[PDB]
Amino acid sequence: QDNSRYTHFLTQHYDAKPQGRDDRYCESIMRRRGLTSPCKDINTFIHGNKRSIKAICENKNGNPHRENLRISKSSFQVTTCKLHGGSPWPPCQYRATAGFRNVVVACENGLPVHLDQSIFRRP
Amino acid sequence: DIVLTQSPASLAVSLGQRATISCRASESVDNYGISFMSWFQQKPGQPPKLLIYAASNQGSGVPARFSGSGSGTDFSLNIHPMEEDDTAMYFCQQSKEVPLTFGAGTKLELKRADAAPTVSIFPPSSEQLTSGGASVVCFLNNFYPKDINVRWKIDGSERQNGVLNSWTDQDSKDSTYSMSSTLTLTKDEYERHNSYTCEATHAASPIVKSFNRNEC
Amino acid sequence: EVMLVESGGGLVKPGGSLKLSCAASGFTFSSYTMSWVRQTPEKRLEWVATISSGGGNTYYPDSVKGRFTISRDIAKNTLYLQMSSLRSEDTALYYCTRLGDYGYAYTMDYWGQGTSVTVSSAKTTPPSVYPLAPGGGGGGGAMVTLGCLVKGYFPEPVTVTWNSGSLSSGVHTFPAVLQSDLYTLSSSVTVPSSPWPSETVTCNVAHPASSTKVDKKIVPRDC
């Protein structure tokens, strides 16, 4: 791998300012973040500023504590890219589903280290 | 392309022991924490059957004695305890990118105690002679190991021209091998000599079978 | 449960064309990506084409691009492989396979039994069948080995049985070898010394490509 689980969380699930959140956005972002070799079945990107995400995981102090699962208090603007039609290799076909909702993440050392991607499957 | 180098090409393992087959990719077959690598098993007379997917997950109805491991560019399939029914051709395959590619394959046989061949020699049929030809056939049945040598003699001299050999696949009941050796001559060459011999060699004491065209 | 029946293979002249089909049943055909994989005479596996569950994506290896076309008839639950400008290198056994989804790491979980394709200029020819009977050594009266030499036939499928299927144990039918545009194979059968001489042993060969069947009784004194 490369850096920490937090840095991977950001490259895999964070996109501050999307220039449109439609199906074209997914076709582009999935290719850009390297999620098309082979075609990934589903992938959600979180929007807005980073501090709001880091805040889901904050602790009173910094005394080492085990990792735990948390449901964020407030809602977030997210965009979920879902594979459509079963294309297994590029050109991967996707469809975007935009949303505003809470997210479930694993937290450690005050940073998000994993997104619960299964909750975005919906229908 | 992602080239898959599978080794070894052939191997024999005794019952209860373990078989290890490896597959090395020229490029990584991983992404998103998954290894897009499969292992297939193909028994004689049948199409390939899924054994392992995602490098280490069992396909349906696949015995626990079959386990796959590895990541990146290096993978292995292990069979332990080896059972008589595991004789087959095994292949690895990657699905990370097109073109989809397969390893060249591994031939797995069951090792067993050595066994000498049962030799039988047959003269050309009268029907074949009438059509103008003459084939002399020699059957070396139920022996082990596969490596065996057949020598043909016509009136005391070795003949090499016209010999064609063929081996059966390992027998599923006694795990032996069988082989046929066919010496094809023209009718004229056959009628020109009298003594025909088939010599089977596996070590130091040939098993010889023969007949005379005349005496019969 | 799941089934994939292939058909449409056969002998085709170099440069010719052929269309293979795969009848799928036992599962929801349109809900899965499908493929064609071939096995050459040397026993190697070569991927030939894939079509997605939705039907909008098709993929091919450089070796057959421009010559092969895969497609599907939803209604008939059938996959197809249209082959053209066939070459000797395309001679092989073609398998129909079902691809697993992302969750199964895009593996091939089901394979059909396959249909053979032979690209050649050689012509369909029936086999000559010759009896193999003992020369004269009738001393090891424990048992006796008899045989059948099946020579000079071409498209490769031939099937051998003894006494119409009755004799099944103690039989060795060897792989066929290609000798000058023609195949040759042999089969041995071992019975007790008590039967044969007294009881009829007959070789039964069938060669579907030429619609032929030959029966050959193994008669004593063959030296």
What HEC string does A13-43 produce? HECCCCCCCCHHHHHHHHHHCCCCCCCCCEE
Interface mutation vs chain C, best among B125, B136, B168, most C CBs within 10 Å: B125
Q: Are B55 and B71 in contact (CB under 8 A)?
A: yes
The radius of gyration of chain B from alpha carbons, rounded to an integer in Å, stands at 23
Q: Which of A8, A47, A84, A114 is catalytic?
A: A114
Dist. CA B139–CA B149, nearest whole Å: 12
Nearest to C103 by CA among C15, C190, C33: C33
Work out whether strand B10-13 and strand B106-110 pair parallel, antiparallel, or are unpaired: parallel
Q: Are B114 and B144 in contact (CB under 8 A)?
A: yes
Domain that holds residue A106: 2-123
Query: Domain spanning B113-208 has what CATH number?
Result: 2.60.40.10
Within an 8 Å CB–CB cutoff, is residue B199 touching chain C? no
The residues that bridge with B21 in the sheet, in sequence order, are B77
Dist. CA B137–CA C186, nearest whole Å: 9
Nearest to B114 by CA among B16, B12, B19, B11: B12
Residues of A in contact with B95 (CB under 8 A): 38, 88
Q: Is A57 helix (H, G, I), strand (E, B) or coil?
A: helix
The residue extents of the domains of chain B are 1-112, 113-208
Tokens 């016209």 belong to residue: B162
Residues of A in contact with C54 (CB under 8 A): 84-87, 93
Query: By CA distance, what is C99's nearest residue in A?
Result: A88
Domains in chain C (CATH in brackets) are 1-121 (2.60.40.10), 122-220 (2.60.40.10)
Q: Are C98 and C110 in contact (CB under 8 A)?
A: yes
Interface mutation vs chain B, best among C68, C129, C130, most B CBs within 10 Å: C130
Token reading at A117: 């991607």
User: Is residue A75 classed exposed, middle or buried when 0-12, 13-18 and 19+ CB atoms within 10 A define those classes?
Assistant: exposed
Residues of C in contact with B137 (CB under 8 A): 132, 147, 149, 186
The radius of gyration of chain C from alpha carbons, rounded to an integer in Å, stands at 22
Q: What angle do CA A98, A102, A103 make, to 5 degrees?
A: 90
* B1-112 matches B113-208 in fold: yes
Q: Are C202 and C219 in contact (CB under 8 A)?
A: no
Residues 56-75 of B with CB under 8 A from C: 57, 59-60
Residues 100-119 of C with CB under 8 A from A: 101-103, 106
Q: How far is C34 from chain A (nearest CA, A)?
A: 10
> Hey, what amino acid is at A18?
P
Q: Which residues contact C42 (CB under 8 A, 6 or more apart)?
A: none
E-strand spans in chain C? 3-7, 11-12, 18-25, 34-39, 45-51, 58-59, 68-73, 78-83, 92-99, 108-111, 115-119, 128-132, 143-153, 159-162, 171-173, 177-178, 183-192, 202-207, 212-217
Q: Are C35 and C47 in contact (CB under 8 A)?
A: yes
Tokens 């626990």 belong to residue: B64
Q: Are B116 and B143 in contact (CB under 8 A)?
A: yes
> Hey, what amino acid is at C117?
V
Q: Which of A8, A13, A65, A84 is catalytic?
A: A13
> Is A92 a known ligand-binding residue?
no
Token reading at B154: 């016509």
Q: What angle do CA B167, C141, B180 make, to 5 degrees?
A: 10
Q: Is A5 helix (H, G, I), strand (E, B) or coil?
A: helix
The answer to whether the Cα torsion of C184, C189, C193, C194 is positive or negative is: negative
Tokens 């080995």 belong to residue: C145
Q: How far is A86 from chain B (nearest CA, A)?
A: 14
Token reading at A68: 């735990």
Architecture of domain B1-112: Sandwich (2.60)
Dist. CA A121–CA B19, nearest whole Å: 41
What values do phi and psi take at B81, rounded to 5?
-75, 140
**Using the beta-carbon criterion (under 8 Å), do C184 and B102 form an inter-chain contact?**
no
Q: Is B128 helix (H, G, I), strand (E, B) or coil?
A: helix
Catalytic annotation present for A13: yes
What values do phi and psi take at C3, rounded to 5?
-140, 145
Q: Which residues contact C13 (CB under 8 A, 6 or more apart)?
A: C86, C119, C120, C121
Nearest to B25 by CA among B69, B94, B73, B72: B73
Nearest to B168 by CA among B198, B201, B141, B206: B141
Residues of C in contact with B118 (CB under 8 A): 145
Dist. CA B138–CA B201, nearest whole Å: 13
**Using the beta-carbon criterion (under 8 Å), do C188 and B49 form an inter-chain contact?**
no
Query: By CA distance, what is B119's nearest residue in C?
Result: C145
Entry field: residues in chain C: 223
Catalytic annotation present for A8: no
> Is A70 a known ligand-binding residue?
no
Residues of C in contact with B215 (CB under 8 A): 136, 223
Token reading at B22: 């490896």
Residues of C in contact with B48 (CB under 8 A): 45, 95, 108, 111
* Alpha-carbon distances of C35 from A24, B2, B56, rounded to whole Å: 29, 19, 23
E-strand spans in B72-194? 74-79, 88-94, 101-102, 106-110, 118-122, 133-143, 149-154, 157-159, 163-167, 177-186
Identify the H or E element spanning B67: strand B66-71
Q: Which residues contact C79 (CB under 8 A, 6 or more apart)?
A: C21, C22, C24, C34, C36, C51, C70, C71, C72, C96
Token reading at C32: 């899965």
**Using the beta-carbon criterion (under 8 Å), do B95 and A38 form an inter-chain contact?**
yes
Nearest to B199 by CA among B112, B106, B136: B136
Identify the H or E element spanning C154: none
Dist. CA A99–CA C143, nearest whole Å: 82
Dist. CA C22–CA C209, nearest whole Å: 21
* Alpha-carbon distances of B61 from A13, B70, B144, C87, rounded to whole Å: 37, 22, 32, 39
**Using the beta-carbon criterion (under 8 Å), do C57 and A41 form an inter-chain contact?**
no
Tokens 């191997």 belong to residue: B11
Tokens 């199906």 belong to residue: A23
The residues that bridge with C37 in the sheet, in sequence order, are C47, C95
Dist. CA B168–CA B149, nearest whole Å: 15
Token reading at C33: 């990506």
Token reading at B102: 């397969």
E-strand spans in C16-89? 18-25, 34-39, 45-51, 58-59, 68-73, 78-83
Interface mutation vs chain B, best among A89, A114, A115, most B CBs within 10 Å: A89
Q: Which residues contact C65 (CB under 8 A, 6 or more apart)?
A: none
Q: Which residues contact C147 (CB under 8 A, 6 or more apart)?
A: B120, B122, B137, B139, C131, C132, C133, C186, C187, C188, C189, C218
Q: Which residues contact A35 (CB under 8 A, 6 or more apart)?
A: A12, A43, B32
Q: What angle do CA C198, C202, C206 make, to 5 degrees?
A: 175
Q: Which residues of chain A have a Cβ shorter than 8 Å from any chain B Cβ?
A: 34-35, 37-38, 40, 88-89
Q: Are C20 and C37 in contact (CB under 8 A)?
A: no
Which chains sit next to C, with 3 or more Cβ pairs under 8 A? A, B
Within an 8 Å CB–CB cutoff, is residue C32 touching chain A? yes
- A38, A41, A85: residue with CB nearest C52: A85
Give chain B's end-to-end CA distance (angstroms, integer).
62
Q: How far is B138 from chain C (nearest CA, A)?
A: 10
Q: Is the peptide bond before B8 cis (omega within 30 degrees of 0)?
A: yes
**Using the beta-carbon criterion (under 8 Å), do C45 and B102 form an inter-chain contact?**
yes
What values do phi and psi take at B114, rounded to 5?
-60, 150
Token reading at A41: 């079945």
> Hey, what amino acid is at A11?
T
Residues of C in contact with B89 (CB under 8 A): 43
**C100 DSSP 8-state letter:** P
**Using the beta-carbon criterion (under 8 Å), do C190 and B141 form an inter-chain contact?**
yes
Dist. CA C106–CA C35, nearest whole Å: 11
Q: Are C174 and B180 in contact (CB under 8 A)?
A: yes
Interface mutation vs chain A, best among C31, C53, C58, C102, most A CBs within 10 Å: C102
CB atoms within 10 A of CB B183: 23
Dist. CA C218–CA C215, nearest whole Å: 10
Instruction: Quote the number of domains for chain A.
Output: 1
Q: Which residues contact B48 (CB under 8 A, 6 or more apart)?
A: B40, B41, B42, B91, C45, C95, C108, C111
Dist. CA C166–CA C27, nearest whole Å: 38
Tokens 């290198």 belong to residue: C89
Dist. CA C209–CA C58, nearest whole Å: 33
Tokens 């079978």 belong to residue: B209
**Using the beta-carbon criterion (under 8 Å), do C56 and A40 form an inter-chain contact?**
no
> Is A103 a known ligand-binding residue?
yes
> Is A39 a known ligand-binding residue?
no
What values do phi and psi take at C128, rounded to 5?
-100, 140
